[PDB]
Amino acid sequence: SEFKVTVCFGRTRVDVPCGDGRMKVFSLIQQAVTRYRKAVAKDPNYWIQVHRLEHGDGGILDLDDILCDVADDKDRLVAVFDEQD
């Protein structure tokens, strides 16, 4: 099977299936962020400051480390960001 990680934006969980899995966190954040606003019924009107990601309580995720190295098949992640809603 392919890669798959869930990115919980504040109070919204969004699944992100990686075809190969070789996608840097930075690419995962941008992909999740876009899907987040599109999933929450939002649009490119309010600002969104994506701080960083975290596995939970022992596995932070920054925009540079590969997914296969950080994320894991069917793994959840807490996304901390800002939003002017």
Considering the domain 1-85 in this protein, what is its CATH number? 3.10.20.90
Judged by phi (left if over 0) then psi (alpha if -120 to 50, else beta), residue 21 lies in left
Give the bridge partners for 6, in sequence order: 15, 76
Q: Name the experimental technique.
A: NMR
Cβ contact 65:23 at 8 Å: no
Residue spans of the domains in the chain: they are: 1-85
The CA angle 50-51-53, to the nearest 5 degrees, is: 95
Rounded to the nearest 5°, which phi and psi values hold at 42? Answer: -100, -170
Instruction: Tell me the DSSP string of 6-48.
Output: EEEETTEEEEEEESSS---HHHHHHHHHHHHHHHTT--TTS-E
